[PDB]
């Protein structure tokens, strides 16, 4: 009756190695990068919030909001400095997605992350929907100019605590991220519309599936499409307070959703192992990590 012969990682792996499974969509968030040293905590530290008193954040979460950024960009850039990763070394999970690409299985990775690690791990623009943008590029905010700045330039401005200004026109230079309160890129919707007609497996990793419309992507999968969540905790289930498309891992009616609870790296390693890809993944990670360490 169902595509997965059992609702387990082993069932998913067997399905992936069947003719049924050609196209995998990954949906990822911050949990895929915590083992890269990027914590899934994005609020200012207490010290930072207190340091920002003079910018009169109307509420502490205003630092994520575009309206507030347009009034005072400095809190955001101070937060960016505090949160700036010390290194950009993608995780086992990222490289697992690279293997999906290498093996012709990756239809798309929809990421909420802004840390650029998917790109470093070798997912290309075509493979990616950076649903909430990225720090990979920044732009002058003036439509008349739109000068593009690489992350190296933005990094230098962030760490020097210099509000980044465009060299051509002295406008603010904003990382290409989607602030809270901003609309998602057209690419998100265009790709969603096409990709979810084609998906054979949804692999959801490292996200609490709280932010919309990203979280609603799970409901865009065809009813038959297996959905594997690799995450520290179950996410994406229906909200019992509302009374769609929620994950059903555990009811009597469950037929296609699998939760593997633990570290994304460990889940991807376990899945890779079941697929016969563990050595390939280990070798890829080790060489890429070595290369990044040697930068």
Tell me how far, at minimum, the Cβ of 147 lies from Zn ion, in Å: 4
Residue 268 marked as a ligand binder:
no
What residues from 136 to 195 belong to the interface with Zn ion (CB under 5 A)? 140, 142, 145, 147, 166, 168-169, 171
Identify the active-site residue in 94, 132, 147, 289.
132
Tell me how far, at minimum, the Cβ of 165 lies from Zn ion, in Å: 8
CA distances to 10, 19, 77, 80, 83 from 159, rounded to whole Å, are: 46, 50, 9, 9, 11
The smaller minimum CB distance to Zn ion, of residues 143 and 294, is found at 143
Residue 33 marked as a ligand binder:
yes
For residue 72, the SS3 value is coil
Answer whether 120's CB lies under 8 Å from 128's CB.
Answer: no
Residue 30 marked as a ligand binder:
yes
Residue 21 marked as a ligand binder:
no
Residue 23 marked as a ligand binder:
no
The upper half-sphere exposure of residue 289, i.e. CA atoms within 13 Å in the direction of its Cβ, equals 14
| CA nearest to 97, candidates 125, 75, 70, 127 | 127
Tell me how far, at minimum, the Cβ of 154 lies from Zn ion, in Å: 14
> Where are the alpha helices (H) located in 121-263, listed in sequence order?
151-159, 186-195
The smaller minimum CB distance to Zn ion, of residues 147 and 155, is found at 147
State the number of binding residues for Zn ion (CB under 5 A).
8
Which residues, 6 or more positions from 287, have their beta carbon under 8 angstroms from its beta carbon?
none
The smaller minimum CB distance to Zn ion, of residues 132 and 139, is found at 139
Residue 192 has φ and ψ, to the nearest 5°, of: -55, -45
| Integer Cα distance of 256 and 40 in angstroms | 28
Tell me how far, at minimum, the Cβ of 157 lies from Zn ion, in Å: 14
What residues from 241 to 280 belong to the interface with Zn ion (CB under 5 A)? none
The smaller minimum CB distance to Zn ion, of residues 134 and 171, is found at 171
Please say if 147 is a catalytic residue: no
The smaller minimum CB distance to Zn ion, of residues 94 and 139, is found at 139
| Integer Cα distance of 179 and 172 in angstroms | 15
CA distances to 66, 184, 263 from 133, rounded to whole Å, are: 13, 8, 24
Which residues, 6 or more positions from 125, have their beta carbon under 8 angstroms from its beta carbon?
none
The contact mask relative to Zn ion for 79-118 (x = CB under 5 A, - = no) is ----------------------------------------
Residue 70 marked as a ligand binder:
no
Tell me how far, at minimum, the Cβ of 74 lies from Zn ion, in Å: 19
Output the CA angle 29-21-203, nearest 5 degrees.
10
Residues making up the binding site: 30-34, 40-42, 112-115, 140, 145, 166, 169, 207-208, 231-233, 264
Residues making up the binding site for NAD(+): 30-34, 40-42, 112-115, 207-208, 231-233, 264
By the criterion CB under 5 A, which residues form the site for Zn ion?
140, 142, 145, 147, 166, 168-169, 171
Residues making up the binding site for Zn(2+): 140, 145, 166, 169
Catalytic residues: 132
């Amino acid at each position: 009756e169902r595509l997965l012969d059992e609702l387990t990682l082993e069932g998913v792996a067997r399905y992936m190695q069947s003719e049924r499974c050609r196209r995998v969509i990954c949906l990822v968030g911050a949990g895929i990068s915590t083992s890269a040293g990027i914590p899934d905590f994005r609020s200012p530290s207490t010290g930072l919030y207190d340091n920002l008193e003079k910018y009169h954040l109307p509420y502490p979460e205003a630092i994520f909001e575009i309206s507030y950024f347009k009034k005072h960009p400095e809190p955001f850039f101070a937060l960016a400095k505090e949160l700036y990763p010390g290194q950009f070394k993608p995780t086992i999970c990222h490289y697992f997605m690279r293997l999906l690409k290498d093996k012709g299985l990756l239809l798309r990775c929809y990421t909420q992350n802004i840390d650029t690690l998917e790109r470093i791990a070798g997912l290309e623009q075509e493979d990616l929907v950076e649903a909430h943008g990225t720090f990979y590029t920044s732009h002058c905010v003036s439509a008349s100019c739109r000068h593009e700045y690489p992350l190296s330039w933005m990094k230098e401005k962030i760490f020097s605590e210099v509000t980044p200004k465009c060299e051509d026109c002295q406008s603010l230079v904003k990382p290409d991220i989607v602030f809270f309160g901003e609309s998602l890129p057209a690419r998100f919707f265009s790709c969603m519309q096409s990709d979810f007609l084609k998906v054979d497996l949804l692999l959801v990793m490292g996200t609490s599936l709280q932010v919309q419309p990203f979280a609603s992507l799970i409901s865009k999968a065809p009813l038959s499409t297996p959905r594997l969540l690799i995450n520290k905790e179950k996410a994406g289930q229906s909200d019992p307070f509302l009374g769609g498309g929620g994950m059903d891992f555990d009811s009597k009616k469950a037929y296609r959703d699998v939760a593997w609870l633990g570290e994304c790296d460990q889940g991807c390693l376990a899945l890779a192992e079941l697929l016969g890809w563990k050595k390939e993944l280990e070798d890829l990670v080790r060489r890429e990590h070595a290369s990044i360490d040697a930068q």
